[PDB]
Structures are given as C-alpha cells and as structure tokens.
Design a protein around this ligand. Sequence first.
Ligand SMILES: NC(=O)c1ccc[n+]([C@@H]2O[C@H](COP(=O)([O-])OP(=O)(O)OC[C@H]3O[C@@H](n4cnc5c(N)ncnc54)[C@H](O)[C@@H]3O)[C@@H](O)[C@H]2O)c1
Ligand SMILES: NC(=O)c1ccc[n+]([C@@H]2O[C@H](COP(=O)([O-])OP(=O)(O)OC[C@H]3O[C@@H](n4cnc5c(N)ncnc54)[C@H](O)[C@@H]3O)[C@@H](O)[C@H]2O)c1
Ligand SMILES: [Cl-]
Lengths: 210, 211
Amino acid sequence: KVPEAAISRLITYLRILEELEAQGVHRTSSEQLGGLAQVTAFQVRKDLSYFGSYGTRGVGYTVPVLKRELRHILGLNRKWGLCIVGMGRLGSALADYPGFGESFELRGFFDVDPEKVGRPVRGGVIEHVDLLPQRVPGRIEIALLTVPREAAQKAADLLVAAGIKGILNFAPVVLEVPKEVAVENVDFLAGLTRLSFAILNPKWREEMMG
Amino acid sequence: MKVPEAAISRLITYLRILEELEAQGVHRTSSEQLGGLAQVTAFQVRKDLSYFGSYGTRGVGYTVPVLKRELRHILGLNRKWGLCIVGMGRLGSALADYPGFGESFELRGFFDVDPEKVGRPVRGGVIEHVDLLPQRVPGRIEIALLTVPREAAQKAADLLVAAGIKGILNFAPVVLEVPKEVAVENVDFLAGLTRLSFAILNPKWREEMMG
Ligand SMILES: NC(=O)c1ccc[n+]([C@@H]2O[C@H](COP(=O)([O-])OP(=O)(O)OC[C@H]3O[C@@H](n4cnc5c(N)ncnc54)[C@H](O)[C@@H]3O)[C@@H](O)[C@H]2O)c1
Ligand SMILES: NC(=O)c1ccc[n+]([C@@H]2O[C@H](COP(=O)([O-])OP(=O)(O)OC[C@H]3O[C@@H](n4cnc5c(N)ncnc54)[C@H](O)[C@@H]3O)[C@@H](O)[C@H]2O)c1
Ligand SMILES: [Cl-]
C-alpha cells in the first residue's frame, strides 16, 4: 500500500527543507512548513508522524536532521540503477529526458527489435532484451517498461526473472508480478482531468472547501 | 514550492476506485470503504463528496454507479473534449497512438514545424504546420498536449494561447507563462521513481504484520 499523496507531500517538504537550509534556517516549525507548502501545520505534523518523524513541540524540527530522514525513507540518498525496456518512441524520448536526478541512474536500454539493438543512445547502447539476466543482477534495480501492452506482461515476467526490484510501468495494463516486486503505473489522465475541471471552473480553488 | 491542489486529484482517485468496484460487481459502497481504498479518512471522503453535492445522509453510503456518474459530471468527463498535440516528435507520436484517452478526450489536431513531419499521416489525421493553429483551434480544440523541446516550449504555448487554447497539458520540463484564463498542468513521467524506491525499501509498509 503506497501512500501516493502522502509521498508527493513528503517530496514537497523535502524540497522546502532544502531551501530552508540554504537560507540558513536550522529549525523549522510545522507552522513555517505548512506556510511554505500551503498545507495546515496540523497536516504537516500528521504526515511527518505518519512517516516516523515526530516533532519537538515549541522548538521545531531540526532542518538538516529532518531533511536527512526524508531522504532516507524515500531512498533518495541512494544511487539506483535503472534500465528502459522497449526503446520505441516513448522509451527513446525518456532516455533523453533530463529529469532523472542523481538518485536514479540509467545503466541499460533493451529492445527485441534487431534494427534497434546496437543503436547508441544517451549514456549507452541498445542491447537485446534477451540479455536482461546477464545485465540486471547487481546493477539494475528499476525498469521503465515502455513496450506495447501486448507484450508488457511477458516483458515483466522476464524482468522479474532477471531480478528486477521495481517497475515503472507505462503500458496500459495491470501487471502481475510477485509481491516482492514493486510496480507503479504511470499515466497523464489525471492531469488531463484536472485540466478539464479547471477549464469548467476557472476561478475555483480548493481553499473554498475550507 | 507549494503542494499542488489535491482535492480534484482525490475525486479522480475515487472515480478509479469506483470504476474498479463496479468492475467487481460491487453495487454499493461507503465513505469508509472508499476512504480505505483511496488511503484517506472516511471523514475526508464525506467532506469531499458533501462539498461537491454527492453525499446523501450519514450512513446511507453511496450507490457505485450513481456516484461514478456524478464524479464524471463534476470532473467534466461526461463531455467530449477536443485535443491536439503540438510537437510530433518521439513523445508526441507515441501520444497520438496512446489507446487510453477514452471517450472524454478526442484528438483532433497534430502540429509540428518540421517540413519532414508536416503532411505525414498519423492516427486520425495528418500532421499540420503549427501556423494552422489559429484556424484549427477555435470551437474545435480546447486542450493542447505540449511535447516540444524545452527551448521551444514558451513560444509554442504563446502560439496556443493566441489561437484560443483553454488548457495545456505541458510535458516540457519548464514552467510556462500563460494568462490566468488558460489552465496548465505539467506532466512528470518520472514522479513514480520515488514511489518505487520508497516501496522497494519499505516492502511491508504499514501492514498488519511486517515481520
Ligand atoms: N503511460 C502513458 O502516459 C503513455 C503515453 C505514451 C504511450 N503509452 C505506452 O507506452 C508504450 C510504448 O509506446 P510507444 O509509442 O513508444 O511504442 P512503440 O511501438 O513506438 O515502441 C515500443 C518498443 O517496444 C519494443 N518491444 C516490443 N516488445 C518488446 C519486448 N518483449 N521486449 C523489449 N522490447 C520490446 C519494440 O521493438 C519497440 O521499439 C505502449 O504500451 C504505449 O501504449 C503510455
Ligand atoms: N514530462 C515527461 O515525463 C517527459 C518524458 C519524455 C520527454 N519529455 C519532454 O517531451 C518533449 C518532447 O521530447 P521528444 O523526445 O519527443 O523530442 P523530439 O526532439 O523527438 O521531438 C520534438 C518535436 O518538437 C517539434 N517542435 C519544435 N518546436 C516546435 C514548435 N514551435 N511547434 C510545434 N512543434 C515543434 C520538432 O520539430 C520535433 O518533431 C521535450 O520537452 C522533452 O524533454 C517529458
Ligand atoms: Cl498525478
């Protein structure tokens, strides 16, 4: 059970903590945090406790300490090895996308099409998907799955067999994998829907909900 | 730096849940069951659905198909929106073939500036030059999927605003400048990475038994 909204909130707090530290703030109250995140101080205290970081009432959280805890629980203090499986149009575009950060490093690009295998790409070369078992163990923990839906489950079974630990699934299907293998499905439909709502209600803001 | 607006995201979550509860033959549900499946307190569910008018009375719960139709109306999904893709490169072309838009969103235009792309056939049409926006958008296309390189994003957006776009789903890694009259949502396909690292390191997160 992955608390998606809570996590997105933690990442927000982390980003705020990074700036607070840069600005020379050693301790920050749930009030200051909520103010910057635009969330109730009560909610901030709740999220932090929800994740194990309890407050020091009237004193505030120690910025560098809290920042470190958030980085640790989120796994951002590690260097994760990733690969893209399915170097088609979406997969190739992702290989060039500059949003991975230092915590996530692409170390493999795979495909089943021999016309693509051998093609150089940013930071590597496309290898045949049949090499997963020779490339994943001890090097790649997360795979970006960008193959057509018709082959997604099969590609996932191969990833699982090769030792993958997590799959960022772009194919529009629900994958079946052992419980030990994490999977997150990505889509832009929620964003499209938020646009839909916003276009129909241009002046609405959630604060109106109180 | 602020947490993005979440209320609408919660409604979208409830709708996914309801779609699956409905798939499971479930005909009736509760704020408690919904709250659990969406990982939000029963209280938050009631407060949300009350505010948007789908709440009945304390204890009556909800009728899955009724509530689903209501959430769809509120979200604007019972409408058919016209979309376009601006920037028919790799991501843009993948999007033109994405099979999950559904009935609510219908692609009606594909634009680029590359003469080698313009005139090329694609699912449902042909790639046209971005200069055609002013004569293609009005009354036919309300939402634009922006998939041009970062460096060209703002000016592409300016052109969209000028042509009459109402909303932009921005995939370019940059913050756009647009009048408050035009809604904007930025996509981040890599947001899930941190949810996976979290999941991989906390495999039994909050379970009844983690040992
Ligand atoms: N989640 C989203 O928002 C989103 C938006 C874009 C597209 N889609 C999905 O992204 C996926 C890729 O779309 P695309 O337009 O790039 O498709 P594509 O046809 O351009 O590319 C798919 C690539 O997968 C490779 N492939 C097929 N089977 C394979 C296997 N078993 N192992 C390894 N590689 C294999 C092909 O050779 C090809 O290069 C599809 O499932 C598509 O529907 C999702
Ligand atoms: N949000 C995400 O998760 C995500 C992941 C994929 C890539 N990216 C972004 O998606 C965008 C597209 O990436 P790509 O790999 O497909 O790029 P690409 O270079 O393959 O294609 C870009 C296309 O934009 C067209 N273009 C340039 N200026 C234009 C203009 N003014 N009007 C219309 N078309 C124009 C080009 O002619 C080209 O066909 C980039 O900004 C990239 O960083 C985002
Ligand atoms: Cl989202």
